[PDB]
Amino acid sequence: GPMPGKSVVARVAEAYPEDVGKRIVRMDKYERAKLGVSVGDYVEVKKV
Amino acid sequence: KSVVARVAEAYPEDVGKRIVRMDKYERAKLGVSVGDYVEVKKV
């Protein structure tokens, strides 16, 4: 059933070269599902 | 030092690995390095 979006803790990995400078983060469907976001949505990232 | 970024899909090889790919500008603005851990939340 529907779950609310939750914060996710993830390990930083380096960007693919075509993505550099585009202010994107690539995250898979499991992280997006837990976050409650779709591709093209915006997220806030903070150090932990 | 929160930074806003747009979500893009994962490369197939990265699916299931609990990573977030971000470039050198984002890492600098966040003050993090590859391998560090970050918290991500929906805007």
Query: Is B12 touching A (CB cutoff 8 A)?
Result: no
Q: Which residues of B touch A10 (CB under 8 A)?
A: 18-20, 37-38, 40
- Please tell me which residue of chain B has the smallest CA distance to A33: B42
B1/A46 CB distance under 8 A: yes
Half-sphere exposure of A2 (CA within 13 A, CB side): 3
Domains of chain B by residue range: 1-43
- Please tell me which residue of chain B has the smallest CA distance to A13: B21
Q: How was this structure determined?
A: X-ray
Q: Which residues pair with B20 in a beta bridge?
A: A12
Rounded Cα distance, A16 and A8, in Å: 21
| Reported structure resolution in angstroms | 1.6
> What is the C-alpha end-to-end distance of chain B, expressed in Å?
15
User: Could you tell me which of A20, A1, A13 has the C-alpha nearest to residue A45?
Assistant: A13
Query: Is B28 touching A (CB cutoff 8 A)?
Result: no
